[PDB]
């Protein structure tokens with residue numbers, strides 16, 4: 001299968017036609033996505049198979065072929081870019097200044113951008129092109145708008 | 157049966173479209189990985 005670093009769509013043929021259920025990041029030979037996109041199922045890349053290696057429902061993250069590799073963090077000050085990969089549409093960069101999710105266990109960056117559910121797992125990047133987290137686990141606020149956490153894993 | 161397809165490189169685009177606001181929200185995260193608003 002294709003192992004080149006980059007952003008990938010996660011598709012299924014179980015439903016009508018070919019449906020995009022999410023997105024992920026290939027980096028250092030490991031595939032990174034959100035848990036709710038694959039529910040921990042194995043994936044296919046051409047004729048090759050990617051088996052889950054680590055996952056956690058609460059963090060809503062999963063890695064395939066190896067441990068979570070992404071460790072960059074939002075600096076708390078700068079604008080970032082969502083590299084949105086919407087279903088049936090070309091990858092597109094959207095720049096934004098993150099807001100904050102304040103929790104009893106600390107603050108997390110959050111991006112107020114509304115994309116289809118199938119865009120979950122799209123990477124959020126800093127100005128160096130490093131992935132600071134994945135888009136797709138968040139909340140619907142008063143006005144009906146979607147705000148995603150910037151969800152990042154731990155590199156062991 | 158799920159499969160992946162390459163969609164692009166991961167790079168910062170100079171002069172990309174700039175949008176979105178920056179809300180500061182109080183939230184809670186449950187054991188199922190669901191975020192909710194704290195009011």
Ligand SMILES: Nc1nnc2ccccn12
Nearest residue numbers: 114115116117120136146
């Ligand atoms: N726009 C929107 N509403 N709910 C969700 C969930 C995941 C990703 C995007 N979403």
